[PDB]
Every structure is written in structure tokens, then in C-alpha cells.
């Protein structure tokens, strides 16, 4: 495996990240009688677990199947939300996301916008697991989130544990804004911790600072804060260099200020991503950084990502960022 | 047979299945008389009347803000000729609650609905009075209070939403029927046969209203389909299907009127084509209402004269107001204002502090 | 009526139409016997085993590449139980160079065209005899010899393109026909709207030809559409449909043989639904086998065992391959590689020179 | 109006943007017996008259109308490619090219490298008309560049004048590689200029240096090269300062070599786009830029585009980038 995962609010339960979705997302039926969840293959619980029990819970007509349309499952999951009720869609891939991109972008981002706030679409929330899995390939790799950056009107979220997954998901679905929550696929069982059985919630647009440091600033999403975790303790051994560890979690609205705290203290930044070097977020926080903290970057910004190439099957080892491509970007940044 | 896709037998020759001709109801013919006493829906003479005034005032205002756009006064228009009759029937057969979706040819889902002219020409000149705040295109309508959701440019979009809205709506089991206007283009989208198929198996109290005039801007529908219309897909996806004369006022009441009958009983969708066209909706009820002795030659003038006046005074008063504070560009992106949203309305403040002089900021608030 | 949406007459009292069941057309019975001797198609003794020696080809390499993937040996692996015949079927009843579309249970088809069993392991396991160069997962198979265009997970992506390519082909009129493959979930996707319309307004020469096995992943059908299957919806669009037996390959080879001849001539596209499930195709042709006296048991244990042969010689091999060299993962993203694309190729040569030890290189070509 | 437009091959005759479009189509269709083009509208001449008189001259079977279906006319395109035959579909306004959005970048943009180059759809291109036009609102006025510069696969190109158009769109109908042509419409009667009649062709992945310039660079595409080309006038006259004005004209993928060059020499560069800011294709440029050129920035990059806002109708004067706020923003990076 590529990455290492390491793991207040009353009794607690040890949860992998598709329990903690569950968790979430009972917790929300329970509280909101209006909420159903709906989408591909959720009545039996979903190909990834994520809905088990909820059926036999809730009932047939809170948690059910539609037909097999993205654009659908997004249009029907704005008009539920249009009356107010609470609409959790899931899209089976995120790779799958596409199809249903002009109601994300054209309808759902806009809704409250161009009507003057007569209408809106804020209760309808779209989960969707994302990210490499070791052998996805093309269309069940993808990290979507840099072509919604794009998007004013919609909040992108990604948790990095089991416990930031409930806490951040509660928060999504409860936002009054149309939400898209990317869960990594690869962490679904892979990572488990204590979380709590009752709800809580983690504030959007917020980054969180996991480690303090003072050489250099590390800032990463999903899967890939793990990887510079790591990357941040080899660099401590190997190269006697303090890292500031910090996971974004919200793509957009994103946590400037967090951010550019960090690097004006450390004066470097490294971002990491799977996704595509090109058009990916890391350019916006980059670009950003370099105009709010022009006088105290020491050296240029460095951008780990994804190559700018489909997501391959055989090839996953060699395309991936992985904590020696960050390490010998950091090394050289630091050797600048 | 034992299949779980669909009921049927077996059959021991090779034979494929041909596209099976709907016929149009009718209840008047061009002269005004009831074809069918059967059929009649006898409405009282008071909502017929406003059947007839709702026309013709939104005949009226079409005339005046289309000679409008021509001049430039407004940046775009689209009228409601030939689509008077299929809105204001549909809208009369409705319970004031029912949520309408649509396009461009609803303005007489609103007309009827008693939607001020003040506020159909203040979206359209987006000045101060548009709740839309001066967002959208003109014609671009919505109204919460009259529960006619807002109208946006992409095409079909609404049609899955109305469906969801339906499904909400059968939980919250209140007795409401939700309504989807579109045209035979539209239907052409991926969007329409989400909507109708989502209807179908979620079993959703929805009316589809479908308006077929035989073209999508310079489109003959024979580019846009080869079955017999879109009444003819209705029965694929499961769905109760008719198809009515769009100049016939009573007939678009009628199957109206009974498909949100049974749609709100039955918790399913109803899908109604109704045929118009580039025997005008307005010349046909005219006909009728002279039949029964319910209006004459001094009252249509009198009307004539009254409707031009209303409209524009709504006209002059549009005109001189003034359009929204500028600061209205940044609001309702999202419901709350992001810090980051809000440092770029700082810099446009800031902007217009020092570069004022270069924009027009007299015809704005504030 | 002289409207241009629809050829109909008016109709006086208000009637809606309701989901007015399609039969299935079947050849064969479960054991073997031709139901209606019009129908045989009475296909030659060699042409009849092939079709069977490629269904239960297809069978043993699923057997044994399904418990690869058990092993963890390959990534994923979807098998072609119960659609043998269907996919064998109507791939006999098309021209060599017909052009197949599909998605993940066509492997019959390649099977049938003499596809070799080293290139399906090839792709399976990503190796260097993969002429997909390893990049997407097991089963995506392609082949431009044997014209089988590339298979892409998204569903329902490929039902619009195979119409673009069935119009292109009318265009160079040279007498071949498209054949699009897709499940009944996949119909639900607005993709297949498209393709559907598309190809019977542009009139193009296109075989839709859909499975329905009652269920997409856990979904049944009665969550998928509620009208009479597919084929029910072939009519509304203007498209000739049928409905046949998918465990008679018969009954499918007379459907696509007929559907290819007409869709061809006609420029014209055809639906076949086929009915399967989770009375097999392979055990009703082999009883139509021994009431002929064409197969026998001691020939049936000789197959079986030359089959399970030259499957796993091709195992062994397709494992004991290197995979690709580490740099196909740049070439192909454009035609011609672009210059910041190379510097990214260049920049893990660079990396792998200094880290090399920690990644997989043994394994890679080169 | 927001800007102003001002203007070896063979004849030439004026021609404003639409008619050039027309021109390259007509040298498309005349030497190429595969090619067709279809869409929305297109035979009796298109809302934008881009291709009146093709269908009389070419053929119904050759110019035609397709149903009212995006996704359907770019999935029909990239079949029609991958038998060979030369395929430009049109997309009515750029706004509309949503619902395509996955036959876009999981299909066309993947169809070479996951096949292995079995097959391609390198011959199919996607025009559609794009940007502001002073009153377009949300769905007439969109720039959707940003969102199709992270799918590797596709090229994404963009002119600013009659002739720079039929000279780009016919290398992108001739390019072998799926490409996607915006036409900013507010030029297509607007700019007008001498046009070879005969067919030539352009590079793609080239930018175009107009104006030279010591003091700072200055980049943008479209429409907005003649605001910054305005723009570099009022610095010239106002300033003393000497702008080095450049057309990107190719997004992806883009010419980073004409740029850092440019900036290497100025020190100084100004990105400006009507797209919104967030996301926007200026935050490539910026992050890329200050990687390859970190030693020779002297101020900040500084970015002017549009707000993270969807586009207004009425708003719009206070919305675009115009010559006052890319003039404002020119004269702080200057005082830097
Ligand atoms: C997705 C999308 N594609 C294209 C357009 C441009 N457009 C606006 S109206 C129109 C014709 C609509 O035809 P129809 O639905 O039949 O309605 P009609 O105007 O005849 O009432 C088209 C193509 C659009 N608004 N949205
Ligand atoms: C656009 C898209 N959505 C969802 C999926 C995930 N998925 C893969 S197979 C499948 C079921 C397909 O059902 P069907 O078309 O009926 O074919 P069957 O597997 O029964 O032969 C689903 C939902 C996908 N590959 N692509
Ligand atoms: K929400
Ligand atoms: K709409
Ligand atoms: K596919
Ligand atoms: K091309
Ligand atoms: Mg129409
Ligand atoms: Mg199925």
C-alpha cells in the first residue's frame, strides 16, 4: 500500500470510513424526518457498504434505488431539495459524476443565485467515493474535485479519516448549500478509528494543522494527507527539516488563511495531489499563496500531482505521487 | 415465459414490431361549439371570462415589451403567441398550490395565477422591484408565492427536478400534483427521459406538458423524432398518455383537470401533447363566449382599452426605475457570503471609489 | 388536424392511452427441438459447432479467470455466464467487418471472430503482448482487426457513438451495419435516448441489440422502468423492435440475421431485447447437437478436455509475461506527445534512476 | 463596448468572425469528402450564421440538423470520428456543452490512450460560440475554458480575430486529436479584417506576442486580448510603462515556453480572463510561471478576472475585467 493511516463527543465506537458514513448518515435520518437517500444500488446497502441497514431502519421510501442516470439522480435530487426536504444522492463513482455535471454546474450551483433566493437547492447533498484504489485504471481512480473548483455556488468536502468523514459529512448534509462530499474509496476499510455514536459536526471551510512545523508547509486532501504525514517524518530523519503538516478538507470555499498563516511562518510550500498536474487545485492554492505571501516564500512553490495522463491499470505504481515523489520535491526545495 | 424483465409468451414466428396514429381531442370546434355535450366542462361563466382576460392581457403585453426589445430597451423577449390557450387551460385545471416548472411559454401559467404586470416587466428590465435582483435574461420568471419555480435558460433541466419535487411532495402526502411544461425539442434531451422514467418507477404525482408545435427554432420536427410524436413515448416508459388541441382552451382544461385527478389519487405520471402551432386559442373562446351571450362587441373594446392602459402604466413605471445596488452581483451566490466573495465586492467598492466616472452608476441604486 | 407534429385525426370524448406484453420469439425448446420448421434457419453442421465450441470455450476461460481474480492474480474479471448465447448468436449472423460496440459481457463475440486466448489474458493482466498497453482494467477488451471497438466502463457511452459510426458507414456506403450491445440498466441512461433518437431521425443502418437479465448490479427492473421492458419503447422512437429467447442461439441468429439485412437496406435501425438471466444456451444447442447426430459424449469429453488445454496453455503464458515498459503510461494521452508531457516522462526516469529500488521495476518491460 | 477591435497568403477579402468561420468550413468540406458538420440548427445557416450556404453547396447528407440532445451530438461526432471521417459538431452557445461534458473528457479525451491506439476519435472537433456579449446573463455569456484544461486528451483553442480564427480552426479540424474551438461571439460581427480566401493554418500550442514590451508581460485569449491591448496604450501613455502584450490562443496545451521567456525578460506578468478567478486557467499560468521563473519575478502575478460569481445580466459592466480594473491592477504591480 502506498500510504500508512495513523489514527469530547460522548461514547465513541471504532469505525472504519464506510461505517462512519453510516453513521452519519442514521444519525441524519433520525434527526430529519424530510431526509431520504437515494441513488444507484443503495437499498441493499451499497457496493461499498455505505447504506447498510438504513433501508430496514427508515423505510422503502427514505432509502431507495433509481434507475441507472447520473443526470437523473442529480435533477431529481435538486427538485427534493427545491421543496426543502433533505435529498443525500449518491453517485456510485465519482468517475460518474460527468453525466450529471450541467445539473451540478448549470443548475444546482446557480439555483439561489438567479432567483434572487426564491428558490434554492441547499438541502441536497451528492456523496460519491474517489480516488486511486491500486487498480481502478481509468474510471474507478478519479479525483474530481479541481473541474467543481471551478464552480461558484457549490462546497466541495473531503475528509482524510473515519472521524473527519462523520463529523464533515454531518456538516455537509446540514449546510444550506448544494455540497458534493468525495469519500476515498481506498480508506473505506483501510482506515479505523474511535468515532463518536452521536452527531457532531466538523466546520466547513477550515483546514486543520495535524502537525506544527517551521521549515516548510505541507498541504494535501483525502488519502494523500497520509502520504505526506510520512513524508513529514522522513524529512525530520533524513534531512533534520521541521514540516508543517495540513489537510485542506474543503476544496471550495477553501481555507486561505489557514494556508497562508502557515507559509509565511515557514516561508515554503509543497502541494500534493493524485489528480492531474494541469488545470488541478493545487495551481489555485499555489497561485494564491505566491500573491498573498509574495515577500516571505524562500523558494518557488512545488506542485506533486498526478501526471497529466488518464488514470492507467498496470501502470497505478509509477503514476502516483507517492511519498518519495514528495520527499526528493521537498528535498530539492529545501536544497533551494 | 419465467423472465424477470417482462411479462409475456412465447411466439413461434419472426416478427419485428412496427411503430404502431394518436388522434387529438377536441371539446370546440373553430366556431366555438361544444362538439360533445358529453364533454363539456361548464365552468362558470366568471372563469371563463378570466380564462378569456388572461389571454388577451398577456396578448397585450407581449406586444408591447416585443416592440420594446426591437427598440432595445429591454435585451430579449420571447412572446407568448399561440401558447395563450395551453397555459391559461392548464393553469384554470390546477389547485393554486400545485408547483408548475417550465421554460419560455409560461408567462399565462403566471397571468392566470394573478402575477402583477409590475413585476413581469421588472424582471424583465431587471431593475429594483425584479425579486430575481436583476440576474437573469428577460422572461426569466419565478414566483415563490405562486409557486411557479424559476425559469432557467438550459433546456429540460427542470424536468427530472420536477419529478423530485413530485416524489417530496407524495411523502409529505399533502395533496399537490407538480406540472412540467416543455416543448417537443426539449424532449429530445437526455434530461426528458430521466424525468419520464424516474416518474414511472418512483411513482410520482407528476403531470408532463408537453407543447408541440412542429418546431425547435429552425428545427421541423421531423428532424427531432420519427414516432408518432411525443404522446407515442408515454406508453414505453409506463405513463398514461393523451394528446389534445392546443387552440382548444376546454380540451387542455379537461385532460388536465382529470390527469391531476387521478395523478394526486394514484400517486402516477401523466403525460398530455398538446398540438399548436408558429382557429387561434383566443379567436375560438371569443366564439364561444359570444354564443352564450357572455360578451359582445362594446365589451371587447372596452377590454381592448382597459388592458392597453394597465399594461402601460406597469410599462412607464418599469422604465423609470432603477436597477439594483451593484453590491446585489455578490449575494446568493451561496445562502451566507464567503470572506473570500466578500474581499472581491470590497475591491469592486474600492474600484468605483477611484473609477466611478467610467460606469453607470446613475441608473443603479444607491 | 393540419398540425406538423403528429399525422392524426381529432377524437371527441377524452380517452388516455394506457401502457397498452411483447412476446418472445423462440426457435428451440429446452430440449432441442425446433419448435416451427419455417424457422430453422438449418445453419450447416460446421458453422452449428463452432457456435458451440466458442460458447463453451468462452465458459472454460471464465471458470479459470474467475478464479484468477479469487487469487488476487488479476484485478477484476466479469464473466459471459448465461449470455453465450446471445453474443455468439449474433455475432454469426453478422458480416465479418460489421463493427461491434458493446460493454462487459461481449467477450462471445470476440470469441466467435477467432479473438486469440493469449490476447484476452493479455488485456486481462496487463501485459506486454496487450495491445491496450496494459492502461485500462481486465475485461475492457478491444480489437481493430476484428473491428470491436474498445470497451469503456461509463455505461451507455458507447450507444450515440455507435450511431455516429453506423451514419459514417451509410455515408461511405459500402454494406455494413453497426451493432451496439447494452444491458436494460444502461437503457436508462439519457445516452441511450440519444443514441435511439438520433439513429431514427439521421436513419442510420444500427442493430441496438440490449440484455435484459432482470437486474443492474442489485437493482430488478421493476426499479429500473416500468413500461414492457425495452422493447417496448423501440415504437416510440420510430425504430422496428423485437423480443427474443437469449438461451436459444437460434432464435437470436435469426432475429440479428433479419435485423442486419433490413437495418442495411433500409438504412433503418432495429432493437433486439434479449431475455437471459443471472434451460442454458449451451446445454438446449447441445441437445439440438445429438438429435442431429452431430456431438456425442466421448466428443463432448475430448472438447472439453482440448478446451480446458488451450486455455490454460494461454494462462501460463499470459503470467509468465513482463508487464509494459513504465513509459507507455505517457504515449498515447495525445497522438504526438506533447513537450510538457515529455518533460513529465522525463521526470520519473530521473526519479526511478535515484529511487528505483522502491518501486516494482523487475516486473516491467525494459 | 467593453473593447475595441483593430486589425503572404493569397487573396484575401474582409471578413468579419462569423464569415471567416464560414471560410474555413468551406475549405474543410471542399478537401476533405469525409468531413460533415451538424448540430443544432446548422442547416439553414446556425443562430450565428456561421454555416449559411454549406448545406446548398455540400449536401443535406453533409450539413444537418441533429435532435435537439448535447450528448447525443458529441457521442454521434466521436463515432463518426472513430470510422475516420472528419466530424465538427456544433454546440449552440458554450453553456450548453454541460450535458456533453462526459462524452467529452471520459470518452473523447480517453478514446486514443485506453485503447492503445487501437482506435481514435482524433478527427472530430466541437465549435461553439463563447464569452460575454453584454447581456447574455448565465447561460449566453459563459467562458468554460478552465473546466476542460484538466482532461489531458483534448486541445482547447481559442482566437481573438477573423483572420486568427479560420487560420486555428482549420488546424484543429485537421489536428488528430479531438479538439474544442471557442468563438467569441461578441466579435462575430464586431471584428472585421482582411481574410485569405484559400485555406491556412495556424500552430496550435502557440502563443502570439502582438505588442513588445521591457516592462511587464501581459496574457490573455479572446476578446480580452483586445482589452489588455488597450490596456497596454493607457500604461504606455499614462505610465511610461512598456507592456509586452501576448495571445495565449491555445489553452491546452498551452505555450509555457513563449511565456516564461516573456516574463524572464519583463519580470512582471498580468493574467486576465472574463472566466471566474477561482479555478480560472490563470491560476495554471500563475503557478507555472512563478516555478519556472521564480528568480526573475520582481512583484507578484496578479490575476484579473472575473468574480466567483455566476454572470449577470444586468450586472454585467461591473462584472468583467475591463481596462480600468486590468489598467488599476497593472499600476499597483508596477508601484510593487
Ligand atoms: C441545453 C440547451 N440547448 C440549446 C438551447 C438553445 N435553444 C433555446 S430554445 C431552443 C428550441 C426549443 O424548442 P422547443 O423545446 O420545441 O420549444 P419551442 O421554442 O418551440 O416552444 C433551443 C435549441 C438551450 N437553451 N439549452
Ligand atoms: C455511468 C455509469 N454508472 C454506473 C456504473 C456502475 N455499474 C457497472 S455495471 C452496472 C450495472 C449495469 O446493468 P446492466 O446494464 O443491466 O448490465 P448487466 O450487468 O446486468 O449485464 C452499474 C450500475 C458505470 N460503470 N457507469
Ligand atoms: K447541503
Ligand atoms: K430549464
Ligand atoms: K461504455
Ligand atoms: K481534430
Ligand atoms: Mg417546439
Ligand atoms: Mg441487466
Redesign the interface.
Given at each position: 500500500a502506498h500510504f500508512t493511516f495513523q489514527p469530547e463527543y460522548g461514547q465513541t465506537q471504532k469505525m472504519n470510513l464506510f461505517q462512519s458514513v453510516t453513521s452519519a448518515l442514521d444519525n441524519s435520518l433520525a434527526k430529519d424526518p424530510?431526509a431520504?437517500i437515494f441513488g444507484?444500488?443503495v437499498?441493499?446497502g451499497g457496493?461499498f457498504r455505505c447504506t447498510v441497514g438504513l433501508r430496514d431502519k427508515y423505510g422503502k421510501?427514505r432509502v431507495?434505488?433509481?434507475?441507472?442516470?447520473?443526470?437523473?439522480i442529480?435533477?431529481?435530487?435538486?427538485?427534493?431539495?427545491?421543496?426543502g426536504?433533505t435529498?443525500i444522492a449518491e453517485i456510485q463513482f465519482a468517475?460518474?459524476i460527468?453525466?450529471a455535471?450541467?445539473?451540478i454546474?448549470?443548475?444546482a450551483?446557480?439555483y439561489?443565485?438567479?432567483?434572487?433566493?426564491?428558490?434554492?437547492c441547499?438541502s441536497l447533498t451528492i456523496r460519491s467515493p474517489w480516488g486511486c484504489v491500486?487498480?481502478?485504471?481509468?474510471?474507478?481512480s478519479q479525483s474530481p474535485e479541481?473541474?467543481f473548483?471551478?464552480?461558484?455556488?457549490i462546497?466541495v468536502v473531503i475528509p482524510r479519516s473515519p472521524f473527519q468523514a462523520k463529523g464533515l459529512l454531518l456538516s455537509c448534509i446540514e449546510d444550506?448549500?448544494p455540497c458534493i462530499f468525495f469519500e476515498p474509496k481506498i480508506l473505506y476499510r483501510a482506515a479505523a478509528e474511535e468515532v463518536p455514536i452521536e452527531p457532531y459536526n466538523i466546520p466547513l471551510?477550515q483546514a486543520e494543522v495535524i502537525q506544527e512545523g517551521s521549515d516548510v508547509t505541507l498541504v494535501a486532501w483525502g488519502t494523500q494527507v497520509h502520504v505526506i504525514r510520512e513524508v513529514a517524518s522522513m524529512a525530520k530523519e533524513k534531512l533534520g527539516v521541521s514540516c508543517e503538516v495540513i489537510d485542506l478538507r474543503t476544496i471550495?470555499?477553501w481555507d486561505?488563511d489557514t494556508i497562508c498563516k502557515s507559509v509565511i511562518k515557514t516561508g515554503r510550500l509543497l502541494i500534493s495531489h493524485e489528480?492531474?498536474?494541469?488545470?488541478?487545485?493545487?495551481?489555485?492554492i499555489?497561485?494564491?499563496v505566491?500573491?498573498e505571501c509574495?515577500l516571505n516564500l524562500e523558494?518557488?512553490?512545488?506542485?506533486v500531482c498526478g501526471?497529466?495522463?488518464?488514470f492507467?491499470?498496470?501502470?497505478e505504481?509509477?503514476?502516483i505521487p507517492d511519498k518519495?515523489?514528495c520527499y526528493?520535491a521537498l528535498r530539492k526545495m529545501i536544497n533551494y | 415465459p419465467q423472465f424477470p424483465g417482462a411479462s409475456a409468451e412465447f411466439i413461434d414466428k419472426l416478427e419485428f414490431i412496427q411503430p404502431n396514429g394518436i388522434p387529438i381531442y377536441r371539446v370546440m370546434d373553430r366556431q366555438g361549439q361544444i362538439i360533445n355535450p358529453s364533454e363539456d366542462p361548464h365552468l362558470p361563466k366568471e372563469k371563463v371570462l378570466k380564462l378569456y382576460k388572461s389571454m388577451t392581457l398577456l396578448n397585450t403585453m407581449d406586444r408591447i415589451l416585443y416592440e420594446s426589445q426591437r427598440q432595445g430597451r429591454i435585451s430579449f423577449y420571447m412572446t407568448n403567441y399561440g401558447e395563450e390557450g395551453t397555459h391559461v387551460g392548464s393553469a384554470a385545471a390546477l389547485d393554486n398550490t400545485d408547483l408548475v416548472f417550465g421554460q419560455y411559454r409560461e408567462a399565462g401559467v403566471l397571468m392566470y395565477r394573478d402575477y402583477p404586470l409590475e413585476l413581469f416587466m421588472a424582471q424583465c428590465y431587471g431593475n429594483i422591484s425584479d425579486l430575481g435582483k436583476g440576474r437573469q435574461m428577460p422572461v426569466h420568471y419565478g414566483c415563490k408565492e405562486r409557486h411557479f419555480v424559476t425559469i432557467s435558460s438550459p433546456l429540460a433541466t427542470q424536468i427530472p427536478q420536477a419529478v423530485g419535487a413530485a416524489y417530496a411532495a407524495k411523502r409529505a402526502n399533502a395533496n399537490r400534483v407538480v406540472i412540467c411544461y416543455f416543448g417537443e425539442g426539449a424532449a429530445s434531451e437526455g434530461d426528458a427521459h430521466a424525468g419520464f422514467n424516474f416518474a414511472a418507477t418512483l411513482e410520482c404525482p407528476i403531470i408532463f406538458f408537453c407543447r408541440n408545435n412542429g418546431y425547435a427554432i429552425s428545427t421541423p420536427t421531423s428532424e427531432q423524432y420519427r414516432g408518432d410524436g411525443i404522446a407515442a413515448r408515454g406508453p414505453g416508459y409506463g405513463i398514461m398518455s393523451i394528446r389534445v388541441d392546443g387552440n382548444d382552451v376546454f380540451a387542455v382544461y379537461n385532460a388536465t383537470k382529470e390527469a391531476r385527478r387521478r395523478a394526486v389519487a394514484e400517486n402516477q405520471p401523466f403525460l398530455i401533447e398538446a398540438m399548436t402551432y408558429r382557429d387561434h386559442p383566443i379567436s375560438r373562446l371569443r366564439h364561444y363566449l359570444l354564443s352564450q351571450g357572455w360578451w359582445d362587441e362594446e365589451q371587447e373594446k372596452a377590454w381592448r382599452k382597459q388592458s392597453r392602459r394597465k399594461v402601460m402604466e406597469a410599462f412607464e413605471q418599469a422604465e423609470r426605475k432603477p436597477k439594483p445596488n451593484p453590491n446585489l452581483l455578490f449575494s446568493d451566490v451561496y445562502q451566507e457570503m464567503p470572506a473570500q466573495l466578500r474581499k472581491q465586492q470590497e475591491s469592486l467598492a474600492r474600484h468605483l471609489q477611484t473609477y466611478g466616472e467610467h460606469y453607470p452608476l446613475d441608473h443603479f441604486d444607491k
Open positions: 424530510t431520504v444507484e444500488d437499498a441493499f457496493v421510501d431507495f434505488n433509481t434507475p441507472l442516470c447520473e443526470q437523473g442529480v435533477g431529481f435530487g435538486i427538485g427534493i431539495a427545491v421543496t426536504a435529498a468517475d460518474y460527468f453525466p455535471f450541467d445539473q454546474v448549470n443548475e450551483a446557480k439561489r443565485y438567479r432567483s434572487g433566493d426564491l428558490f434554492n441547499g491500486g487498480h481502478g485504471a481509468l474510471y474507478h479541481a473541474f473548483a471551478h464552480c461558484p455556488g462546497k444550506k448549500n471551510s471550495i470555499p486561505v489528480a492531474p498536474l494541469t488545470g488541478g487545485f493545487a495551481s489555485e499555489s497561485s494564491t505566491q500573491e509574495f523558494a518557488p512553490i512545488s506542485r501526471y497529466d495522463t488518464p492507467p491499470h498496470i501502470f505504481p509509477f503514476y518519495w515523489k526528493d | -
